[PDB]
């Protein structure tokens, strides 16, 4: 079954978004951490990782590059979960790597029809 990981420190935010991709039929892979984002990642092979950048203790934008930054790992979408999306943080997002961005409070149609987008389009 395709997988995806999400990186949430919030346990709520992490209640909806497993729930929410839980009932497209998808299963998922759960941390709280972007160190351990990425030992997942390259372990698990999941098809797209749920990023928050907004983790306590690093910047989920360094997570990403290091991501991409890996001929392992870099095929794979990353999705931002953000507090802030103005013009300009979209556009920083987009800088960073991230094939798309879900901004606070979650539409939550917005995030299936993208995720969905992202997962089943034929390459």
Same mark, same amino acid.
């Given at each position: 079954? &395709?997988?995806? /990981? $999400?990186?949430? @420190?919030?346990? !709520?935010?992490?209640?909806?978004?497993?729930?929410?991709?839980?009932?497209?039929?998808?299963?998922?892979?759960?941390?709280?951490?972007?160190?351990?984002?990425?030992?997942?990642?390259?372990?698990? &092979?999941?098809? /797209? $990782?749920?990023? @928050?950048?907004? !983790?306590?203790?690093?910047?989920?934008?360094?997570?990403?590059?290091?991501?991409?930054?890996?001929?392992?790992?870099?095929?794979?979408?990353?999705?931002?979960?953000?507090?802030?999306?103005?013009?300009?943080?979209?556009?920083?997002?987009?800088?960073?790597?991230?094939?798309?961005?879900?901004?606070?409070?979650?539409?939550?149609?917005?995030?299936?029809?993208?995720?969905?987008?992202?997962?089943?389009?034929?390459?």
């Amino acid at each position: 079954t &395709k997988k995806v /990981l $999400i990186v949430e @420190d919030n346990e !709520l935010n992490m209640k909806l978004f497993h729930d929410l991709l839980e009932a497209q039929g998808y299963e998922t892979l759960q941390t709280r951490e972007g160190l351990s984002a990425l030992s997942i990642a390259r372990e698990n &092979k999941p098809d /797209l $990782i749920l990023m @928050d950048i907004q !983790l306590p203790e690093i910047s989920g934008l360094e997570v990403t590059k290091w991501l991409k930054e890996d001929d392992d790992l870099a095929h794979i979408p990353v999705v931002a979960v953000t507090a802030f999306a103005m013009k300009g943080d979209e556009e920083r997002i987009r800088e960073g790597g991230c094939e798309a961005y879900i901004s606070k409070p979650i539409s939550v149609v917005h995030f299936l029809e993208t995720i969905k987008r992202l997962l089943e389009r034929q390459p």
